[PDB]
Design a protein that fits this description.
Length: about 160
């Protein structure tokens, strides 16, 4: 099970960790990917998860897109978790660097409520351009299921914990 997490609320937990290493250790039922609408896993969390699957996540994702078309910003899809988890919940947060509306971040976190427990990154943070402090606030105010947040960057983790409330 999940270990070394700081408890933020009744249902939200956080740890300074690489979500790939966390997924490989815990083998959670669900790992969340910080996806884009095309499921093109090039960088950030998506590029790291995909590389850990030896590109099997991208091969599966290209078949999904060929059949279904792109996701909506704020939407999600459930695909295989490969060697990392039972399932991967690909969630698209708004990318502020591409000009998407930050109000879609709450819709993105609502996808987590369809799963009892999840290992996840902060949505729209990193290369997506949003303020991670805002992202954690939206996560805590939107997700009601048990979410274990892995924050890769130690300096950001400390800033998030010391400013939480
Ligand atoms: C958790 N979060 C991650 N990320 C969050 C936004 C993004 N980033 C940008 N600066 C700091 N981190 C990537 C990653 C990347 C690999 N493994 C991870 N585990």
């Amino acid at each position: 099970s999940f270990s070394g997490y700081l408890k933020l609320t009744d249902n939200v937990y956080i740890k300074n960790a690489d979500i790939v290493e966390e997924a490989k250790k815990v083998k959670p039922t669900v790992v969340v990917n910080a996806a884009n609408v095309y499921l093109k896993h090039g960088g950030g969390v998506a590029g790291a998860l995909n590389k850990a699957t030896n590109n099997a996540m991208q091969v599966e994702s290209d078949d999904y897109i060929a059949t279904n078309g792109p996701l909506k910003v704020g939407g999600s899809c459930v695909l295989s978790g490969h060697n990392l988890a039972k399932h991967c919940l690909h969630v698209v947060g708004p990318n502020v660097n591409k000009g998407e509306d930050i109000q879609l971040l709450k819709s993105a976190y609502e996808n987590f409520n369809q799963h009892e427990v999840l290992l996840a990154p902060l949505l729209s943070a990193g290369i997506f351009g949003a303020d991670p402090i805002h992202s954690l606030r939206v996560c805590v105010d939107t997700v009601r299921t048990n979410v274990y947040l892995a924050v890769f960057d130690k300096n950001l983790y400390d800033k998030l914990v010391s400013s939480f409330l």
